[PDB]
Design an enzyme around this catalytic site. Structure first.
Site, PDB file in Angstrom:
ATOM      1  N   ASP A  25       0.996  -1.264   0.091  1.00  0.00           N
ATOM      2  CA  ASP A  25      -0.104  -0.067   0.011  1.00  0.00           C
ATOM      3  C   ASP A  25       0.881   1.321  -0.069  1.00  0.00           C
ATOM      4  O   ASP A  25       1.591   1.696   1.045  1.00  0.00           O
ATOM      5  CB  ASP A  25      -1.055  -0.184   1.277  1.00  0.00           C
ATOM      6  CG  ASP A  25      -1.909   0.979   1.301  1.00  0.00           C
ATOM      7  OD1 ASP A  25      -1.966   2.143   0.866  1.00  0.00           O
ATOM      8  OD2 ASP A  25      -3.264   0.458   1.680  1.00  0.00           O
ATOM      9  N   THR A  26       0.733   2.093  -0.902  1.00  0.00           N
ATOM     10  CA  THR A  26       1.649   3.356  -1.119  1.00  0.00           C
ATOM     11  C   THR A  26       0.879   4.542  -0.694  1.00  0.00           C
ATOM     12  O   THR A  26       1.664   5.516  -0.360  1.00  0.00           O
ATOM     13  CB  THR A  26       2.094   3.536  -2.533  1.00  0.00           C
ATOM     14  OG1 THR A  26       0.699   3.494  -3.501  1.00  0.00           O
ATOM     15  CG2 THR A  26       3.232   2.785  -3.098  1.00  0.00           C
ATOM     16  N   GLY A  27      -0.204   4.246  -0.170  1.00  0.00           N
ATOM     17  CA  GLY A  27      -0.968   5.578   0.476  1.00  0.00           C
ATOM     18  C   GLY A  27      -0.998   5.236   2.016  1.00  0.00           C
ATOM     19  O   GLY A  27      -1.379   6.512   2.658  1.00  0.00           O
TER      20      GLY A  27
HETATM   21  C1  LIG Z   1      -8.135  -1.191   2.516  1.00  0.00           C
HETATM   22  C2  LIG Z   1      -7.109  -0.167   1.305  1.00  0.00           C
HETATM   23  C3  LIG Z   1      -7.461   1.254   1.332  1.00  0.00           C
HETATM   24  C4  LIG Z   1      -8.833   1.474   1.174  1.00  0.00           C
HETATM   25  C5  LIG Z   1      -8.996   2.694   0.254  1.00  0.00           C
HETATM   26  C6  LIG Z   1     -10.413   3.035  -0.285  1.00  0.00           C
HETATM   27  C7  LIG Z   1     -11.314   2.518   0.011  1.00  0.00           C
HETATM   28  C8  LIG Z   1     -11.284   1.334   0.533  1.00  0.00           C
HETATM   29  C9  LIG Z   1      -9.855   0.546   1.171  1.00  0.00           C
HETATM   30  C10 LIG Z   1      -7.117   2.014   2.710  1.00  0.00           C
HETATM   31  C11 LIG Z   1      -5.716   2.509   2.739  1.00  0.00           C
HETATM   32  O1  LIG Z   1      -5.045   2.549   1.587  1.00  0.00           O
HETATM   33  C12 LIG Z   1      -5.324   3.330   3.534  1.00  0.00           C
HETATM   34  C13 LIG Z   1      -6.139   3.395   4.994  1.00  0.00           C
HETATM   35  O2  LIG Z   1      -7.089   2.492   5.101  1.00  0.00           O
HETATM   36  C14 LIG Z   1      -7.654   1.835   3.991  1.00  0.00           C
HETATM   37  O3  LIG Z   1      -8.878   1.437   3.913  1.00  0.00           O
HETATM   38  C15 LIG Z   1      -5.709   4.093   6.106  1.00  0.00           C
HETATM   39  C16 LIG Z   1      -5.445   5.463   5.956  1.00  0.00           C
HETATM   40  C17 LIG Z   1      -5.585   6.021   4.601  1.00  0.00           C
HETATM   41  C18 LIG Z   1      -4.590   5.578   3.420  1.00  0.00           C
HETATM   42  C19 LIG Z   1      -4.017   4.256   3.493  1.00  0.00           C
END
Ligand SMILES: CC[C@@H](c1ccccc1)c1c(O)c2c(oc1=O)CCCCC2
Lengths: 99, 99
Positions: A25-27
């Site tokens: 996960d890059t975010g």
């Molecule tokens: C599960 C993967 C993902 C996601 C994104 C949109 C809709 C559904 C799920 C997701 C992230 O990439 C991050 C967080 O929480 C997440 O659910 C936590 C904080 C924000 C960035 C990382």
């Protein structure tokens, strides 16, 4: 290697010898995994997801093996519906997003 | 171009004329943003992630402008704590994740 992103970039990692499947996960800034028990030191902590908050445990100095690389990382454990490896381990492996 | 993940991969985007700062997330299947209004042509959706679910309005064929490129992709609006661009948009720009 190259991940085309056409499908979820999933892979196998070993947390102190234990094999688990994770999505790169890059975010995310940190790393969360469910189903693991460790002997390193830790401290309780609450993380904020996209949907809301969950309760976790945070271990330090945890040896990880991924993509044939070994690193000493910090990782969270809890009841997450998806296992993720965030930027904290990604940068230590030399991974990048290209265009 | 290429981003080293030492800094959150954040960029400025132009969705149908309106500017938004967004995070490039490879762990997300879809794209959700807040603050942008795109019309009375939407379909209701629900999405799940860590901590829960978010209710969104799905809009197809929206014109986006990021990284000197113009694409037409699908966007979801809703109450997210951070604006996300997921795999659907990253594949359209041709971006990849390399080790
Ligand atoms: C599960 C993967 C993902 C996601 C994104 C949109 C809709 C559904 C799920 C997701 C992230 O990439 C991050 C967080 O929480 C997440 O659910 C936590 C904080 C924000 C960035 C990382």
């Amino acid at each position: 290697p190259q991940f085309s992103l056409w499908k979820r970039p999933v892979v196998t990692a070993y947390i102190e010898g234990q094999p688990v499947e994770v999505l790169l996960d890059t975010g995310a800034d940190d790393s969360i995994v469910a189903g693991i028990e460790l002997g390193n030191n830790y401290s309780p902590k609450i993380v904020g997801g996209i949907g809301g908050f969950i309760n976790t445990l945070e271990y330090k100095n945890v040896e990880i093996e991924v993509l044939n690389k070994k690193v000493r990382a910090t990782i969270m454990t809890g009841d997450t519906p998806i296992n993720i490896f965030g930027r904290n381990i990604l940068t230590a492996l030399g991974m990048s997003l290209n265009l």
